[PDB]
């Protein structure tokens, strides 16, 4: 779980921040 | 699986019958024998030869795989 | 895990209701236009795969109008006299000739 929980919250940032950039552009 | 039992030989055993052999030979004999190998045992039998007279066969054994042809004199009931 | 092993060692009739028989599912009607769209692509799909190779009108069982195509046919009486006339022709032909 030490390896599970870190690496699966890393892609979560990747999926999250990719979406955040789409939101930050659509606001323009 | 299951396979099958030997025939109901009891219905035909101990009767008097004539037997036929290759080469047109005739035998008359009483039969009383059975085994898992399905051989035949003949007793008090007499042979009718194609090239001679007749002789009496004393307690005769016949291998079951070789020959099996029978003619009985008593009607089955 | 012993309960996970417990099944290894080891009633619909009371729930049938008006919803089960579909009395309470079809008042909406928005299903049909979606069904239509899939239904036509099916017709095209079978055509492409194949390309390489009295009436009565009545209210039906489900309340929606249907049609019955009753068969019209000679019943036994009409065909009985039809074969009668046929067999008389060959009999009289054979009797004279």
């Amino acid at each position: 779980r030490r390896e599970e929980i870190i690496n699966k919250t890393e892609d979560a940032c990747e999926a999250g921040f990719a979406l955040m950039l789409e939101m930050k552009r659509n606001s323009r | 699986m299951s396979k099958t039992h030997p025939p109901e030989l009891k219905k035909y055993m101990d009767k008097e019958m004539d037997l036929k052999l290759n080469g047109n030979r005739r035998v008359s004999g009483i039969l009383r024998g059975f085994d898992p190998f399905m051989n035949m045992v003949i007793d008090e039998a007499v042979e009718y030869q194609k090239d001679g007279g007749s002789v009496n066969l004393g307690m005769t054994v016949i291998r079951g795989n070789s020959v099996v042809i029978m003619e009985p004199k008593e009607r089955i009931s | 895990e012993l309960f996970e092993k417990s099944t290894e060692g080891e009633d619909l009739l009371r729930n049938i209701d008006a919803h089960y028989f579909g009395y309470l599912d079809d008042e909406d009607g928005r299903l049909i236009p979606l069904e239509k769209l899939i239904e036509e692509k099916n017709i095209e799909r079978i055509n492409k795969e194949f390309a390489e190779k009295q009436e009565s009108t009545v209210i039906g069982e489900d309340g929606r109008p249907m049609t019955i195509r009753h068969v019209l046919l000679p019943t036994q009486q009409d065909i009985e006299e039809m074969l009668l006339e046929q067999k008389k022709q060959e009999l009289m032909a054979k009797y004279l000739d």
Partner: protein
């Protein structure tokens, strides 16, 4: 469950009716059949034999061993099965 013995089911259906068979000696037999075995041994009760010239004889019993024989002709009724 068991699913085996398809010819045996057909062979059981052939029992009780009349069969024709030929032997290595060349003559033809006609007989009524009611005995069957997995090893193809068969027995006929009441039988008529006819030779390829003009002689015929009647036989009350004939026993057939399934492994040193020519093949037998089975009744038509089996086609219904």
């Amino acid at each position: 469950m068991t699913s085996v013995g398809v010819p045996i089911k057909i062979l059981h259906e052939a029992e009780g009716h009349m069969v024709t068979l030929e032997t290595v000696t060349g003559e033809v037999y006609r007989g009524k059949l009611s005995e069957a075995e997995d090893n193809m041994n068969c027995q006929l009760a009441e039988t008529v034999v006819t030779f390829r010239d003009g002689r015929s004889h009647q036989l009350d019993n004939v026993f057939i061993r399934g492994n040193k024989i020519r093949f037998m002709i089975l009744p038509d009724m089996l086609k219904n099965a």
